[PDB]
């Protein structure tokens, strides 16, 4: 909401370090957050009438942004479903939706993940951006165990104006991203 | 009803509900309730956030289990990947390793069947 616990932290606790850290000149020039994406393949638009909207009202139930129903671009014999419509669910988070999300994720989510011993440190690489996956979806607060017929993993991709990994690394690190280190 | 590692049991007494955990046998479950003075017979569907919390307290730190124990044991079994400990050279070839009759039975450590012909 224009401001959050993490947003502040970034501005008055991370902003400083990085500069002092890599020594940036211009204000802008220092790592900021562009957007964090969270999609789901599902691949379950098969027979039995693949509603799987529950996964849409949910994906967004924990995000606050109804997702965008992506479809198959080509068409594959090998694993049924092809040519069009079928599967695909994905929402793009920016600004405040971006912050009020990462918070929970970093504070309440990542925490309870079967074993979770930090976040694999290689998922950066050349990417002034980062990527990571989740098996469950109940790892979040806004949703409980009872209500969720089936499971639902998902990919989370954070984009950064960072050019290097160190730049990206440090940032997500000063923010609160745990790390398999 | 998520306990150590969000593993969720329910609607029946805790005593057995705890069992529904990889690292909690009927024993470690009966020795876990008296150590927090709760009523065994109570249905998991009712118990102070405290009863549950201090319960998820013990459990988790009292002993290492599922996830961490689960995974861990596999590694236990790994180590027997030395140079040739006869207790490992049975683990490599899915066969019992505690000296069980092999001619017959010993099915549980070898999938269904393979049959083949005779003489």
């Amino acid at each position: 909401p224009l401001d959050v616990a993490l947003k502040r932290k970034y501005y008055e606790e991370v902003r400083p370090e990085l500069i002092r850290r890599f020594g940036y000149q211009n204000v802008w020039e220092v790592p900021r957050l562009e957007k964090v994406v969270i999609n789901q393949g599902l691949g379950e638009a098969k027979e039995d009438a693949r509603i799987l909207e529950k996964a849409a009202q949910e994906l967004a139930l924990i995000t606050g942004q109804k997702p965008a129903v992506t479809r198959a671009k080509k068409s594959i014999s090998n694993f049924k479903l092809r040519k069009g419509m079928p599967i695909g669910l994905r929402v793009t988070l920016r600004r405040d939706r971006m912050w009020i999300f990462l918070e929970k994720l970093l504070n309440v989510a990542l925490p309870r993940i079967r074993d979770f011993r930090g976040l694999n440190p290689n998922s950066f690489d050349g990417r002034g951006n980062y990527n990571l996956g989740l098996r469950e979806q109940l790892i979040f607060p806004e949703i409980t165990y009872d209500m969720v017929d089936a499971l639902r993993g998902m990919d989370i991709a954070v984009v950064t104006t960072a050019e290097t990994d160190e730049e990206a690394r440090a940032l997500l690190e000063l923010l609160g991203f745990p790390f398999r280190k | 009803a998520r306990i150590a590692g969000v593993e969720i049991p329910r609607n029946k007494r805790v005593d057995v509900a705890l069992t529904y955990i990889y690292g909690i046998g009927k024993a470690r479950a009966k020795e876990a309730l008296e150590k927090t003075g709760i009523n065994p017979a109570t249905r998991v569907k009712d118990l102070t956030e405290a009863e549950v919390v201090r319960l998820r307290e013990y459990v988790e730190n009292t002993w290492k289990l599922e996830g961490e124990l689960r995974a861990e044991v596999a590694a236990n079994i790994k180590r027997l990947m030395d140079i040739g400990c006869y207790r490992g050279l049975r683990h490599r070839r899915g066969l019992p390793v505690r000296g069980q009759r092999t001619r017959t039975n010993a099915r549980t450590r070898k999938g269904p069947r393979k049959t083949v012909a005779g003489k």
């Binding site: 504070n107 309440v108 925490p111 | 969000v6 956030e49 549950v52």
Partner: peptide, 30 residues
């Protein structure tokens, strides 16, 4: 809407999302 994270590991979290009635059975305490 704002919210509250009522774990068990003490530690409450005042932020935003939907339904400020959250029983986070395990915050960042492990």
């Amino acid at each position: 809407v704002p919210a509250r994270i009522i774990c068990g590991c003490g530690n409450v979290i005042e932020t935003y999302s939907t339904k400020p009635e959250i029983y986070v059975e395990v915050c960042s305490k492990c």
